[PDB]
């Protein structure tokens, strides 16, 4: 494995890689977010020539994970439109896995697919506590507010 690694959160703390690696952070985290550069070792000297022009542009393309860590561990009051079955509960023949899913036909794509639940979420309209991925390595409580849909 020989790549040019380009991220500035979670565990990476370089804006280049010029030698080989025992760990593929490429095709793992950085290629799911369009924020890596490829290498043949034919071009690493060249990359470091190109970097003086490039890096101030490139620094924002490697800001996609930064975004997520920054804007969600902040204190937040998340407004969610949610729906209630006929027993008045948001859980009649719904349960946990439909009370979240809604992006099925309309919207754009979203960065989420798992959250361990140490509490019950999305219970009824009002405030409730929701313990979540403030970043994809870092678990901490956000506040939710549920409104009618």
């Amino acid at each position: 494995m020989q790549v040019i690694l380009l991220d500035k959160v979670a565990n990476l703390g370089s804006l280049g890689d010029q030698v080989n690696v025992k760990a593929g952070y490429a095709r793992n985290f950085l290629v799911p977010q369009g924020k890596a550069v490829p290498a043949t070792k034919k071009n690493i000297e060249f990359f470091e020539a190109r970097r003086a022009e490039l890096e101030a542009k490139l620094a924002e393309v490697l800001a996609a994970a930064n975004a997520r860590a920054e804007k969600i561990n902040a204190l937040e009051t998340v407004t969610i439109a949610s729906k209630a079955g006929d027993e008045g509960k948001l859980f009649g023949s719904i349960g946990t896995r439909d009370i979240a899913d809604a992006v099925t036909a309309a919207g754009v794509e979203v960065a989420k697919s798992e959250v361990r639940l140490p509490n019950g979420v999305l219970r009824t309209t009002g405030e409730h506590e929701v313990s979540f991925q403030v970043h994809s390595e870092v678990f901490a409580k956000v506040i939710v507010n549920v409104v009618a849909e």
Binding site: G24, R27, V31, P38, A39, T40, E109
Partner: protein, 77 residues
């Protein structure tokens, strides 16, 4: 499949001769990580079958050329 989509491969001929010194066939295989990669201008995942050491080829060449040859072929379901 053991055929990677960035290099041609075969499971090769393979014997012991290393714990009884008598050459009896056991055969050798690749791994075949049936492995997803991402396409950002389509906001989706597409899948390329790589083997062990064959992933290391994709890393050293560039994913993008391989990823473009599947687009050049069309995705089919």
């Amino acid at each position: 499949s053991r055929v990677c989509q960035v290099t041609g491969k075969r499971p090769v001929t393979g014997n012991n001769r290393s714990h009884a010194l008598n050459a009896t066939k056991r055969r050798f295989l690749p791994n075949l990580h049936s492995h997803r990669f991402w396409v950002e201008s389509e906001k989706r995942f597409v899948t390329l079958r790589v083997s062990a050491k064959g992933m290391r080829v994709i890393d050293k060449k560039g994913i993008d050329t391989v990823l473009a040859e599947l687009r050049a072929r069309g995705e089919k379901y």
